[PDB]
Design a protein around this nucleic acid. Structure first.
Lengths: 92, 145, 159, 204, 100, 96, 232, 74
RNA sequence: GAGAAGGAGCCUGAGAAACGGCUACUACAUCCAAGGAAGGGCAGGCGCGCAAAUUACCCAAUCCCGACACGGGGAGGUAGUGACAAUAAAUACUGAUACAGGGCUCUUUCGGGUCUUGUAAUUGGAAUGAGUACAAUUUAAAUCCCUUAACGAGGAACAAUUGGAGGGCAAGUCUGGUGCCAGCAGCCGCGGUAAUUCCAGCUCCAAUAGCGUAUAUU
């Protein structure tokens, strides 16, 4: 259930904020990235509609999962800067 | 992690039961086990170890004892530390070298030799036979960061 | 070659392996090693190639703890054999470290993944061990010996 | 050397018995048996085949349906009903036999029965198998495993390295067109009937 | 020169080498124990993966065939934790460097 | 023989089914015709109730003999496209 | 459609960028004397991630190369071109290392406003007008008359006018932009004419290593006068 | 309302000769043959088998023949 | 390097003597209402009547072209088959009780050797992957992997084979011969198929996820 965000970059010119996001569910089942976007709306004080996470490789032996969360300054910035398949995976 | 009160990770590599561990404000460890005479500097979030083996090397020569076990550790700064072995050995070490920087034997001297009165139940107490004293060695260590 | 027959059988029986395939395979490993030993004797003493390559190979062998920390010379490098390679074979460590009553029970345990070395559980009983790791072998948390769930038979008997 | 050995092995397999041919210069329409279990859509295969060959949807195709597919030759497609008796009829007739197999169900007894009777009375020219109703599978691993095992069993029953095509769904209520197309591709590339003494001595 | 590199790495260099932990470098349920060089290669793969934090396709068929070909043609065997070269021209390089 | 390992043949006309004793080699001989030349040679079948499988004018494949009519050379492995030991372990029946 | 292995080695690229490398568009700089802008931003400076990412960032007017916005993705940025990005507000110059590979200097507008461009050729154009062609293929109408070949010129880059010049001088620190000893910072100490073609100079470093380099591939930077701040 | 096939025709063994557990696992068969051979060895030569009994010595618990020499004559 | 049915001539463009086109000649060859009219590629399957690797999917990444942020890309990468090899490895673990008394081995054999072994006995324990699988993830989308909740071994089953040696037989069959013999072997017997439950699943040996046989032969 616990999280860390190493290697965070502002990306001001792409208007996006990039953290190497490590999420750890010890003994819990897998993650539900949409719930992760909900949680990271709160974790970095945003809304769920301008955040998008991909990557999401759970390590060997369960628990830790490495993902890549992208926080845009606007959901429209996400719309203009986001990949098509990533948008429809988010549900837009 | 006490913040969520959970287990996060373990580390193995110790041939002995680990006797002592010291730490600092960074994400590292140092951990000594006894009969291997070995300190281990744990690089925690990358999960590596740095092995450090002691090999202990006007008095009777027999009383001088090598590094029997490896009892206490004190991490002083990010790069040096010290070990205390129960044969009275006090050894400053560097991360940068494989070798101890500086060890001193009989850090608390030798033990008092026992009486002939309790060593032998003889009406004649003879010092011709008597064991050599063992080195009064380290039970505990501390340092301030 | 009835001697070949009985010798291979005694190898398996003393260490309860499965077939002469696996036994011949470990013998092939030994053959490559003793080939190395022969070559490094063919170069004469105090030669630099000999010094560094032989020091290397001896460090390799003592790193996997097969050749003893006592004896550290090319003579004993020649003198090693299959019983020693089987000694550092893994399942033997479960039996000689007192978790499984029998070598076969150890084989079954390794199948259903109850022991680990360091972190990860192991399934292959021919995972060679290292001298530096061999004492760090215990049950995993998910196995009822180590804990976790009590098991399916305890589950059904409670049912 | 090894060239000579391999080549004489090749001619060795190139040998058979010397039987006489008796096929007229305008040979009759060679026959395709359609055969499967009950509830298999024997009917559906007939429908989709005749549409691919004739552009004409038959809402209820029965009987011997005869179709040209090359300037040399032509076929009569005919299914068996669900009786062993008509199965033995079309068995003693046949020259090429499509056998259709049910997927998630496994094998049907009449399927193996007919396989046996065709085996005894004679292996004709060509036999192919179509594994069908494949969209009754949630699990890709399950589907691929079933394909593997039924391939192996059908191989040792039929002969080594057989021909077993796959038919995924039922699209318009008709079939998948690409699958039935390359099916027609492999079956229209034709070979002479194989000389069974019955079909080279008598009239039928 | 690799044997020489290992000797100067451990024996004469008064600087201890970082060892990875025991259970981490087990590859697939025990079917692999990671050696130092390709373990470093794994580290290089992961550090590139976190540089641009992109995902990769796991090694494609051509590089797979290539490295398996090098293995099948290669005089090096990964017995346990260690690698084992054969004893031809690398050792002759040792001989040449020592004459130098 | 010849230049290849196996050879093909028709079986011509069985002798030795008039053979009196059950399992004598003069039951188990059979007369094959070598196709590559047209020869008439003499081959074995490894059991009586499988000689029963070899019927006249059914494709028959012969091969060597390695080990009471001493020195017959040939025995028969695949019958009509299926192996003899197969038929006689009753794996797959005979296609003619 | 060339390979990543056929890509030249002075602009760097790892083993994971796919087998192909983009070819640079034609322009002021030469083909093998180019690092494309995408290779700059996302492969060397990693500011974007994808082809379409870099594409979009350049479709919007956010970057200006040498004071002018550039939109084509593979524009030639060969040597000591200044690149401003106003969002971070940082400018970059493109030099070599001692190893002969591309290096990028972060810089502000104070040093970024000018360019030390190497003169290629002076001529007398139509209307008899003297003009100047520099290494950046920039022409200048009516230069100062003293500047002949093998001199460099400090250029305004906003009006683009002459701001200074350094004469070709055996006694001036120079930079190597070609050949087998490419990218070696040292002082011109001698020059041999070799009239008949391919004359050279003798150039020692700061630490007593003399070597013979061709006046074609030489490039002066200043007598001492580090007019562009080399990284320490 | 269909008709299944059986294990037989799914695995056309037919007229194979029948075998045992001991054969069917080639792990087990070299366990027992190793056991019985080691038992077979316990006929000819002499194995060590621990010390004298923990309760004590109890005679040569299976007889002594006098007139039997088991010495290799060198 | 040479070519886009064959020679000859011509046409655009920055770049072609594109093989892109036109024209003639030649040569096929299509439809036709007979007057006309268009047109010439690779891939595949057979190639004896008998045979063995997808007719998968996407431009997601990298790269390329255009009025051009979007469009298109036969590069590229994703997936499927596999005893041709090669790799790791299941098809079981372990008591307790009862009972039986031989089990086995051999130079040297009408003779010796060594001591706990077996039982198709009764029962107790645990252990579980293969299959099955909710999901979540992965991905262009899928799949695989990692995780992972839940089902999930008592033999007659979640059914290991190929190969050779040998033992035992009938109210059965046949070939010899100075009665009982001796051979060959023998799925056949009197009856009997919903009948029979027997060497009750015989013994040995080798390799066992494989292994034989012919031929050439070294």
């Amino acid at each position: 259930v616990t999280l860390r965000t190493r290697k965070f970059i502002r990306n001001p010119l792409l208007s996006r904020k990039q953290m190497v996001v490590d999420i750890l569910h010890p003994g819990r089942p897998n993650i539900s990235k949409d719930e992760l976007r909900e949680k990271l709306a709160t974790m970095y004080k945003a809304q769920k509609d301008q955040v998008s996470v991909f990557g999401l490789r759970t390590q060997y032996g369960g628990g830790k999962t490495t993902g890549f969360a992208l926080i845009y300054d606007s959901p429209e910035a996400l719309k203009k800067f986001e990949p098509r398949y990533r948008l429809v995976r988010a549900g837009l | 992690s006490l913040d969520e009160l959970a287990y996060v990770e373990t580390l193995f590599g110790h041939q002995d039961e680990i006797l002592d561990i010291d730490a600092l404000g960074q994400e590292r460890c140092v951990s000594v086990g006894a009969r291997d005479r070995t300190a281990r500097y744990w690089k925690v979030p990358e999960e590596s170890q740095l092995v450090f083996r002691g090999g202990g090397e006007g008095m009777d020569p027999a009383s001088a004892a090598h590094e029997g076990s490896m009892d206490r550790v004190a991490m002083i700064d990010d790069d040096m530390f010290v070990t205390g072995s129960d044969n009275g050995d006090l050894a400053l070490w560097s991360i940068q070298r494989k070798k101890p920087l500086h060890v001193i034997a009989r850090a608390h001297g030798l033990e008092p030799p026992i009486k002939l009165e309790d060593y032998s139940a003889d009406e004649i107490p003879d010092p011709s036979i008597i064991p050599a004293p063992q080195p009064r060695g380290i039970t505990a260590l501390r340092t301030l960061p | 070659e009835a001697a070949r027959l009985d010798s291979e059988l005694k190898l398996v029986g003393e260490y309860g392996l499965r077939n002469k395939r696996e036994v011949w395979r470990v013998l092939l490993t030994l053959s490559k090693i003793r080939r190395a030993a022969r070559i490094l004797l063919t170069l004469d003493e105090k030669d630099p190639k000999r010094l560094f390559e032989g020091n290397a190979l001896i460090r390799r062998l003592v790193r996997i703890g097969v050749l003893d920390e006592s004896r550290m010379k090319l003579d004993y490098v020649l003198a090693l054999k299959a019983e020693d390679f089987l000694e550092r074979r893994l399942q033997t460590l479960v039996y000689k470290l007192g978790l499984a009553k029998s070598i076969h029970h150890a084989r079954v345990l390794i199948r259903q993944r109850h022991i680990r070395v360091g972190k990860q559980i192991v399934n292959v009983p021919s995972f060679m061990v290292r001298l530096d790791s061999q004492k760090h072998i215990d049950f995993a948390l998910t196995s009822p010996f180590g804990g976790g769930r009590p098991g399916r038979v305890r589950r059904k008997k409670a049912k | 050397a090894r060239q000579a050995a391999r080549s004489h092995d090749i001619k060795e397999k190139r040998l058979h018995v010397p039987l006489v041919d008796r096929l007229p210069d305008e040979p009759p329409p060679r026959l395709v048996v359609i055969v499967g279990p009950p509830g298999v859509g024997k009917t559906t295969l007939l429908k989709s085949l005749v549409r691919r060959y004739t552009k004409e949807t038959m809402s209820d195709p029965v009987g011997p349906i005869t179709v040209v597919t090359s300037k040399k030759q032509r076929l009569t497609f005919i299914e068996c009903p669900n009786e062993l008796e008509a199965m033995i009829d079309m068995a003693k007739v046949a020259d090429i036999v499509l056998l259709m197999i049910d997927g998630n169900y496994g094998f049907e007894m009449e399927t193996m029965e007919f396989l046996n009777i065709l085996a005894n009375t004679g292996m004709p020219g060509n036999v192919f198998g179509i594994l069908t109703h494949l969209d009754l599978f949630k699990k890709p691993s399950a589907l691929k495993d079933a394909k593997k095992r039924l391939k192996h069993r059908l191989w040792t029953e039929l002969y080594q390295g057989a021909h077993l095509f796959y038919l995924s769904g039922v699209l318009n209520g008709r079939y998948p067109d690409r699958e039935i197309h390359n099916l027609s591709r492999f079956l229209s590339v034709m070979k002479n009937p194989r000389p069974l003494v019955w079909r080279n001595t008598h009239p039928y | 020169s690799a044997t020489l590199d290992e000797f100067i790495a451990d024996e004469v260099s008064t600087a201890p080498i970082a060892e990875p932990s025991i259970g981490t470098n087990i590859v697939k349920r025990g079917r692999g124990l990671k050696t130092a060089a390709e373990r470093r290669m794994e580290e290089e793969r992961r550090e590139y993966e976190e540089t641009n934090f992109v995902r990769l396709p796991k090694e494609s068929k051509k590089e797979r065939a290539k490295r398996a070909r090098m293995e099948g043609r290669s005089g090096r065997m990964n017995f346990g934790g260690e690698e084992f070269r054969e004893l031809g021209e690398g050792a002759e390089r040792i001989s040449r460097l020592t004459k130098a | 023989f010849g230049g290849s390992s196996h050879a093909k043949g028709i079986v011509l006309e069985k002798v030795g089914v008039e053979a009196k004793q059950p399992n004598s080699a003069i039951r188990k001989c059979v007369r094959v015709q070598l196709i590559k030349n047209g020869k008439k040679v003499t081959a074995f079948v490894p059991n009586d109730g499988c000689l029963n499988f070899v019927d006249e004018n059914d494709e028959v494949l012969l091969a060597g003999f390695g080990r009471d009519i001493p020195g017959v050379r040939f025995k028969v492995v695949k019958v009509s496209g299926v192996g003899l030991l197969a038929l006689w372990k009753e794996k797959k029946e005979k296609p003619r | 459609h060339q390979k990543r292995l056929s890509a030249p080695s002075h602009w760097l690229l790892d083993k994971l960028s796919g087998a192909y490398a983009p070819r640079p568009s034609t322009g002021p700089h030469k083909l093998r004397d180019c690092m494309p802008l995408i290779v700059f931003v996302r492969n060397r400076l990693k500011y974007a991630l994808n082809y379409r990412e870099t594409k979009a960032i350049m479709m919007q007017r956010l970057v200006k190369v040498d004071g002018k916005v550039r939109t084509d993705i593979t524009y030639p940025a060969g040597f000591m071109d200044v690149i401003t990005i106003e969002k971070t507000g940082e400018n970059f110059r493109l030099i070599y290392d001692t190893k002969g590979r591309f290096t990028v200097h972060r810089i502000t507008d104070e040093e970024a406003k000018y360019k030390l461009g190497k003169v290629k050729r002076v001529q007398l154009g139509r209307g008899g007008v003297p003009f100047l062609v520099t290494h950046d293929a920039r022409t200048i109408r009516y230069p100062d008359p003293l500047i002949k070949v093998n001199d460099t010129v400090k250029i305004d880059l906003e009006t683009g006018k002459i701001t200074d010049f350094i004469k070709f001088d055996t006694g001036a620190l120079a930079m190597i932009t070609g050949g087998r000893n490419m990218g070696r910072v040292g002082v011109i100490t001698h020059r041999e004419r070799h009239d008949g073609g391919f004359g050279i100079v003798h150039l020692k470093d700061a630490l007593d290593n003399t070597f013979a380099t061709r006046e074609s591939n030489v490039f002066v930077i200043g007598s001492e006068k580090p007019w562009i701040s080399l990284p320490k | 309302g269909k008709r299944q096939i059986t294990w037989q025709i799914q695995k056309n063994k037919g007229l194979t000769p029948n075998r045992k557990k001991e054969q069917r696992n080639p792990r087990v068969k070299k366990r027992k043959k190793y056991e019985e051979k080691q038992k077979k060895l316990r006929s000819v030569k002499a194995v060590y088998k621990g010390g004298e009994g923990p309760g004590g010595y109890q005679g040569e618990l299976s007889g002594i023949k006098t007139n039997l020499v088991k010495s290799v004559k060198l």
